[PDB]
Amino acid sequence: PNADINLEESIRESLQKRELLKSQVEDFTRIFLPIYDSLMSSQNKLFYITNADDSTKFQLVNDVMDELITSSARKELPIFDYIHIDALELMDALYEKIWFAISKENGDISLEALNFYITNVPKAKKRKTLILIQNPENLLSEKILQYFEKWISSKNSKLSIICVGGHNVTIREQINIMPSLKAHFTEIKLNKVDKNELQQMIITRLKSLLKPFHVKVNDKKEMTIYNNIPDNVIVINHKINNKITQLIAKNVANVSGSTEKAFKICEAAVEISKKDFVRKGGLQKGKLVVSQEMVPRYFSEAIN
Numbered sequence: 001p002n003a004d005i006n007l008e009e010s011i012r013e014s015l016q017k018r019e020l021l022k023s024q025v026e027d028f029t030r031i032f033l034p035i036y037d038s039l040m041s042s043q044n045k046l047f048y049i050t051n052a053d054d055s056t057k058f059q060l061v062n063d064v065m066d067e068l069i070t071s072s073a074r075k076e077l078p079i080f081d082y083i084h085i086d087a088l089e090l091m092d093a094l095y096e097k098i099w100f101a102i103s104k105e106n107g108d109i110s111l112e113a114l115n116f117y118i119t120n121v122p123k124a125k126k127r128k129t130l131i132l133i134q135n136p137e138n139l140l141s142e143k144i145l146q147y148f149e150k151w152i153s154s155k156n157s158k159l160s161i162i163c164v165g166g167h168n169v170t171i172r173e174q175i176n177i178m179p180s181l182k183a184h185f186t187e188i189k190l191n192k193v194d195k196n197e198l199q200q201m202i203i204t205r206l207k208s209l210l211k212p213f214h215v216k217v218n219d220k221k222e223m224t225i226y227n228n229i230p231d232n233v234i235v236i237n238h239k240i241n242n243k244i245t246q247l248i249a250k251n252v253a254n255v256s257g258s259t260e261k262a263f264k265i266c267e268a269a270v271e272i273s274k275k276d277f278v279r280k281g282g283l284q285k286g287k288l289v290v291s292q293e294m295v296p297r298y299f300s301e302a303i304n
Contacts, residue, residue, distance in 0.1 A: 024060060027190050031064045034186055038160055039068065039077050042128065044152045044184055048171070049164040051190035053258030058134065060190075061164050065132065080128040091139040101131050102159075115147060119154040132162045137169055145174055149181040167192075167257050193258055199249035202262050206245055209270045210238040210294065215278055223278040236277060238270070240294035248296050255303065268302040269294070 031049060038045045052058055065084070071077045083101040087094065096109040102118065103126075133140065140163075151157045175182050214226035216233040226233050240248075256262040277292040 023191050027057070027060050028064055030188055030190065031061060032067065034188060035064070035068065035160075035162070036071070036077070039080060039128070039130075042078060042158075043160075044154075044157060045160045046148055046152055046181065046185045047160070047162045047188055048169070048185070049162060049188045049190065050169055051167050051192055051257065052164045053166050053193075053256065054260035056260070057190055057258075058164065061132075078128060080130050082130050082132070084132045085134060087133055087135040087137070087139050094133075094139060098131065102126075102129060111147070115150065118151045118157045118159065120156060123156045123158060126158055128158045128160075130160050130162070132164065134164050136163045137165050141171075142174075145171065145178070145181070149178055149184075152184050153180045195250075195253055198256070198259060198262065199253040201259055202249040202252055202266060203245050205263055205266055206240065206249070206294075209266055210240060212237055213274055223281050225274060225278055237291035238273065238294070239291055244294070244296070248294075248299055251296070252299055265299060265302045269298045272301050273298045 035045075035047060038047075049061060052061060062084075065082060068077065068080075069082055072080055081101075085094065085097050085101070089097075092109065095111060095114060096105075099105050099109065099114050099117075102114075148161060151159050152161065172187065175185055212235050214229060214233050214235055215223050216226045216230070217223055218232070252262055252265055256265065273292055273294050276298070277289065280289050282289050
């Protein structure tokens with residue numbers, strides 16, 4: 001040995017790397033193609049990129065933009081200005097972001113004038129401007145959708161807008177009643193992780209998370225956790241019923257859509273569940289508590 005290198009493990013590690021890499025070419029192309037047309041054929045669209053459930057998906061999306069901006073410095077695409085906006089900076093607060101995106105401004109922020117500029121100031125008075133709004137979800141509905149319909153359909157605006165968000169975004173409804181938008185609107189759906197495989201990963205990731213822990217009792221009989229022993233420190237078993245993981249795996253899988261998002265949750269459910277055992281003080285509602293049982297409320301708290 002040597003022997004730290006074998007086929008079976010190398011192949012499997014390699015097949016994964018490959019399946020992953022294929023998935024990112026499929027995702028990159030999905031985003032690139034339609035947006036690239038849009039640009040080439042000087043036209044206005046609203047793209048909604050959905051299923052961007054982890055940071056690696058958002059990284060894909062920023063790479064697709066990097067290429068587009070490159071394809072522009074190469075005359076390969078008509079000149080365009082790009083602006084990225086993280087929607088987690090505050091709602092009225094974004095209008096001045098869209099303004100700034102349109103032109104380098106600064107007074108208040110009249111939706112009325114800002115809208116008049118877009119749709120009325122002449123088209124030869126400005127070039128193509130592409131805005132990417134990251135995580136609109138919340139801050140962005142209803143009126144805004146209408147404004148978008150007017151700005152985008154206008155022949156003076158020269159504006160395409162891209163939104164990127166999770167799956168829990170469903171304006172495919174509100175779009176349908178808006179023909180002048182529906183006509184300029186395309187949904188790009190990224191690769192979904194697959195329910196079964198996903199929940200199986202959470203279950204397995206749960207087992208691994210749930211390992212004994214340690215609490216230290218004081219002269220006050222109070223209980224506290226221990227930095228990973230002394231005589232006044234006891235081991236606690238961390239368990240969860242089988243039939244209940246099944247459920248929690250399913251629901252969390254649903255709420256997550258991404259292995260990355262699920263695992264962050266399990267990790268914190270587990271930290272909460274622990275934090276609770278020490279609350280319970282080893283004695284609760286009559287019977288005494290010697291081990292900790294995982295319950296779904298610990299996950300809801302983890303989520304929010």
